[PDB]
């Protein structure tokens, strides 16, 4: 996913 947003 994305850093800070694993649900991106």
Curated annotation (Swiss-Prot):
Bridged cysteine pairs (disulfide): 2-8
Cysteine amide modifications at: 8
List of residues that carry D-tryptophan: 4
Domain of life: Eukaryota
Record-given protein name: Contryphan-Lo
Organism, as annotated: Conus buxeus loroisii
First-to-last residue of the parent protein present: 55 to 62 of 63
């Amino acid at each position: 996913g994305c850093p800070x947003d694993p649900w991106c």
